[PDB]
Fold 30S ribosomal protein S11.
Amino acid sequence: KNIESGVAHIHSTFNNTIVMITDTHGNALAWSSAGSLGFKGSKKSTPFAAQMAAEAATKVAMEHGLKTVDVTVKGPGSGREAAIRSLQATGLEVTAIRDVTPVPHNGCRPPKRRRV
RNA sequence: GGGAGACUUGAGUGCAGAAGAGGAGAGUGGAAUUCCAUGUGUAGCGGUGAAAUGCGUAGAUAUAUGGAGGAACACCAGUGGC
């Protein structure tokens, strides 16, 4: 109901961007996405859509009560920086930024190349 | 070419060292994917050139914490080595 510090997970893929603001323990507080905001098709990956998604999620989080957030960026999407700037503009203080893109140590076999 | 000898440079042994993803056997480590359980949380997620199929209110994706299991071994790594 009332929080001050939290985490913001930005999942940005080539097709969509999802912003998930949680508490420092990971429990979800608010979230939004390009698709959730009405963007469809290619638009979902545009940085502007990421900007709006971060804006809407931040507004809900601040409404719930939240001042500081630390950012974790995941995925190769092109809207990560747009979301971060949107967070700052909407008001939440960006305490820190880290990248948590998983990096398999070889691990599993990725799917086939396209057009083969 | 044959026979009877001699010789040490080829060949090999000895002695002294060197490096190595060489091979076989038995274990073991972390990353990561998927699945499972339980939290938080609400409407999409996923995907394309564009769409649709598909998954999601039986609460998905995301997110936190665990647990299961299979396979391959990021960085080192290098017309490097064996």
Notes: The two ends of chain A are 52 Å apart (CA to CA).
